[PDB]
Write an enzyme that holds these catalytic residues in place. Structure first.
Site, PDB file in Angstrom:
ATOM      1  N   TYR A 139       0.858  -1.216   0.000  1.00  0.00           N
ATOM      2  CA  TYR A 139       0.000   0.000   0.000  1.00  0.00           C
ATOM      3  C   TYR A 139       0.883   1.251   0.000  1.00  0.00           C
ATOM      4  O   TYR A 139       0.382   2.359   0.202  1.00  0.00           O
ATOM      5  CB  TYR A 139      -0.962   0.019   1.200  1.00  0.00           C
ATOM      6  CG  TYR A 139      -1.329  -1.295   1.852  1.00  0.00           C
ATOM      7  CD1 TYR A 139      -0.623  -1.767   2.952  1.00  0.00           C
ATOM      8  CD2 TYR A 139      -2.416  -2.043   1.420  1.00  0.00           C
ATOM      9  CE1 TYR A 139      -0.956  -2.960   3.578  1.00  0.00           C
ATOM     10  CE2 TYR A 139      -2.765  -3.235   2.037  1.00  0.00           C
ATOM     11  CZ  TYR A 139      -2.034  -3.697   3.121  1.00  0.00           C
ATOM     12  OH  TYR A 139      -2.368  -4.868   3.742  1.00  0.00           O
ATOM     13  N   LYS A 146       6.199  -5.343  -4.384  1.00  0.00           N
ATOM     14  CA  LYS A 146       5.318  -6.475  -4.682  1.00  0.00           C
ATOM     15  C   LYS A 146       5.396  -6.838  -6.166  1.00  0.00           C
ATOM     16  O   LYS A 146       5.573  -8.005  -6.528  1.00  0.00           O
ATOM     17  CB  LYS A 146       3.861  -6.113  -4.343  1.00  0.00           C
ATOM     18  CG  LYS A 146       2.817  -7.235  -4.361  1.00  0.00           C
ATOM     19  CD  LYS A 146       1.511  -6.854  -3.653  1.00  0.00           C
ATOM     20  CE  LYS A 146       0.538  -8.003  -3.444  1.00  0.00           C
ATOM     21  NZ  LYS A 146       0.121  -8.692  -4.703  1.00  0.00           N
ATOM     22  N   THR A 177      -4.311 -11.641  12.507  1.00  0.00           N
ATOM     23  CA  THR A 177      -3.366 -12.212  13.457  1.00  0.00           C
ATOM     24  C   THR A 177      -3.503 -11.495  14.799  1.00  0.00           C
ATOM     25  O   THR A 177      -4.043 -10.394  14.865  1.00  0.00           O
ATOM     26  CB  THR A 177      -1.923 -12.245  12.915  1.00  0.00           C
ATOM     27  OG1 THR A 177      -1.552 -11.045  12.227  1.00  0.00           O
ATOM     28  CG2 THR A 177      -1.641 -13.438  12.028  1.00  0.00           C
TER      29      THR A 177
END
Ligand SMILES: [Ca+2]
Ligand SMILES: [Ca+2]
Lengths: 243, 243, 243, 243
Positions: A139, A146, A177
């Site tokens: 982001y 990426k 998580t």
């Protein structure tokens, strides 16, 4: 057992955000034998836990930021697995993770490091015609890294494929998580992507580990150059409608 | 056994080019129970063979060109599997395959028919939160229908995903089959794509059946909306170099 | 004249492989006023030629490898164009172009440098709601940087778009240049891609400059986040057939 | 004037949602000479208006649902433009727009009809090395037809490219039209996509007509096989953040 007698280097268990643990678990569960790496004798404790839980054949220091560290690591893995009649590696798992320096650092640790392992592991991977798997997360200037990383997958699949080495990536959805949860702004991506994604939930770590197992296993022997989205359909999604 | 007690409708075994056989085999091998369909009591013999080999629970006539035929088929599957405490379907496999009429016909049989099964199977698929899988093959107005079919995967993953139904596709590379082999011009694609693809070979039917198994199995429970290329890396490939 | 009274910073004329010259030409031809940059007082001569040919308003030293150099450059452009009633920039053109260091260096010069200019140019670009354009070329760790660069286009289009700044890329096919021609192995890509591409030729520099003009012009005011392939269809191409 | 003496068949002015009007306007504005088609002597009035406004060389009945209708149309265009020393067409613009029949009908009118015109126009397009342009719009079985149509662009660019015919598409964002506006549920897409898209607005018809002009013009002579998004960046967009 799908992976009886197969050997996997798993890198990234040191991070609580990597999903490398679940991948190791999935692999172990199907009889693979594992060598796990730790970037730092400061961050070794979590890896030793996994080593413990998973019966790791060895636990070797590897900092994926330095070619020399990687070389030493692979010299050591060669000692365990680079000798015998049945020498070689079945898989190597790469599951790691503003100024130009922030960009440089993202690309180095996130993207180039994968090429660095592929190079260091080629001979051994070739010996058993094994595969490479990297993870990507959904982001910043991490978007650029990426994209960089996913492009290395195609280049490497093509350059290594003549030796019978497959090269693939999983792109993981947002996962809930502990700790990751207590951020309160990452919390809020998870809230949203749960409503966005076709399945109306976020994927579990188990789902990512099992997809990883698949790509690393004989079942995926016809698959190379692939980016497998494991994200409950998030990436494919189209328009809000009423949000 | 990965699929103990799971139920799969497999459509397309009638065609020697479909790979549906290998998918059925892969599924059976892991304990699934199968209902196979045949488009025509003229093309039923091959399906009965599979029925035989795979212990098919039933063998039901389905012509994916007609909504009524599909409806009847699903009325029958409902009789076997749409009753009980544990009613429902674990997967439905769609593995089927110039003027405007040629285009119309390609789109109807190749693309819309998949939506047609999804509709007819929704209730049952919902009951067990099962998935849909279609196959695509890798030049005509079949390119247009391929694209059409892959777009239905995203729409359906999104429309069915609220019920817990996953929807995915495999894109299969050129495969060397008997008969397919004796064409002498299809022979020559296979010759070339073997040299093109990263792995320097064509995928086997086993590789496609195992990738199909994966997508239909609990291991793929985090995956929907996906097009999985099973093609030894052919699709990802880039430039001739010296050819 | 499409660009009467519009202002464009063009970076990359120093390179004979960049196509920046043709972009400048295309822009000038339609009445734009140009400030061209040179990376080094060692490589200034070619830029001065263009300055000459194109009536450059100024010629300012910019090394896209250093934030400070970029800052100084933009301080200077601000002096020419960052004052007045009609202050601001209509476009900024970024047309620039193994170990980890080779990767690091590719990403820095090829990919991050574009973000670096966008940052330095934002205020001025905002003032006239102008756009950014980068070029990409079509095999190394330059594949990774290409992917990186194209991802920055989407991030920047999204981050700058609230100010009315468009952000786009051209992906250029193999072009036959002098010198580039006398390499004898690049010569051979050109030979092949001429046979591969739908139009059966390689694009000219004129074709790239005119596509660049378009993206920088009022005609493209509805377009942002785009990668425009200018490559005679090379990228879209599919299978050899008989080669 | 960019298109002095160039000839364009524009199909779709009959629809108030097509943007074909704006394309015709953009083309006329730059000196092109136009032949506009109408699907039906029932829907001819709007086209006659355009004919009037744009100085149309002719106005010919073409229903893109029937090969014969298309053939007759092209017989007539051949009479105007298929004779002389300078015979031929510079462009053809295709700007047209649940059960299986709804799907069949979408694919026929939306997707195949484009191939149908390309066939009928090939000889004339070849004569002047002109191009084809289709439009696509941005939820139904129109998603499947969109994908179908865009795949025809790649096939046609490849099959026609040997004759020097370029083939391209524009993908248009949501546009705010009268009537289209008074729907109150289409109204609401426009409200949302205005907030979603990088530029924080919807594109105008002028922006689409000018992008169309570009692709049809000499400036785009290096571009074929392209899908140009004209949508203020909508398609490229990524995640809600706080919506
Ligand atoms: Ca994929
Ligand atoms: Ca494009």
């Amino acid at each position: 057992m799908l992976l009886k007698g197969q050997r996997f280097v798993v890198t990234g268990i040191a991070s609580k955000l990597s999903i490398a643990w679940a991948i190791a678990e999935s692999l172990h569960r199907e009889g693979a034998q594992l060598i796990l790496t730790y970037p730092n004798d400061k961050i070794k404790k979590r890896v030793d836990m996994a080593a413990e839980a998973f019966d790791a054949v060895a636990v070797i220091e590897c900092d994926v930021g330095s070619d020399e560290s990687i070389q030493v690591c692979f010299d050591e893995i060669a000692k365990h697995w680079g000798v015998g009649d049945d020498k070689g590696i079945d898989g190597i798992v790469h599951a790691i993770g503003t100024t130009r320096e922030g960009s440089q650092i993202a690309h180095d640790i996130s993207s180039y490091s994968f090429v660095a392992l592929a190079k260091a592991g080629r001979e051994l991977l070739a010996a058993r015609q094994g595969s490479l798997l990297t993870l990507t997360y959904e982001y910043n200037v991490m978007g650029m890294a990426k994209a960089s990383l996913e492009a290395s997958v195609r280049y490497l699949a093509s350059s290594l494929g003549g030796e019978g080495i497959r090269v693939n990536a999983i792109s993981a959805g947002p996962i809930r998580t502990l700790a990751a949860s207590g951020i309160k702004s990452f919390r809020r991506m998870l809230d949203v992507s749960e409503k966005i994604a076709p399945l109306q939930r976020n994927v579990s770590q188990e789902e990512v580990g099992n997809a990883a197992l698949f790509l690393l296993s004989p079942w995926a022997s016809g698959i190379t150059g692939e980016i497998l989205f494991v994200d409950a359909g998030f990436n494919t999604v189209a328009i809000s409608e009423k949000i």
